[PDB]
């Protein structure tokens, strides 16, 4: 029975009003709910389908994300995922298949 | 009490015979132990201090790699980690200071 990992690449954070203060700081221009991409992997489903580290994650088959878990479940359960994701005033959609890698060749980040 | 994470920003899989074929295969001019890093994270201190993926990751502080729990043991353990890394036929030295996060603000890779 072989050891399988289903990933798209991204170092995920859930959005808390502390973090939206952070990015209000830094962006004052520019979203109180979803996923935000602190990381993308190099060689992922999310670097090749255009995702960007800043991006929120606010939807995933047009159900609405607020906690990680959440995007944990559908990577692990879905594919691909229709991520809809807030970019500054960009309101963009993405289709992301998980990547599977079998007999335990995932590894693990360090 | 902050939840810390300590991190260098590899993708690290075990050496073992299996992948050494494959290594072989690709490399036939081209190590039957260590830690190989199948990717490394962009804003990383891996990436920062010049670790690429492909390298094999071989001691850390003069002490023998085998096993990826070593490594990772390291890496929450020991600052900063002089790792000796096998790139083809060149022998390198690289120092990687893991990069701490507090507040559990580094998230989760997914």
Do not use: C
Request: charged share 25%.
């Amino acid at each position: 029975g072989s050891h399988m990992k289903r990933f798209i690449g991204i170092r995920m954070r859930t959005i808390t009003p502390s973090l939206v203060d952070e990015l209000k700081a830094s962006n004052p221009d520019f979203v109180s709910s979803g996923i935000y991409v602190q990381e993308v992997a190099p060689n992922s489903p999310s670097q090749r389908g255009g995702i960007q580290d800043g991006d929120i994650i606010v939807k995933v088959n047009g159900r609405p994300l607020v906690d990680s878990s959440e995007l944990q479940e559908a990577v692990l359960t879905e594919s691909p995922l229709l991520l809809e994701v807030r970019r500054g005033n960009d309101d963009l959609l993405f289709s992301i298949a998980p990547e599977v890698v079998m007999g335990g060749g995932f590894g693990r980040w360090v």
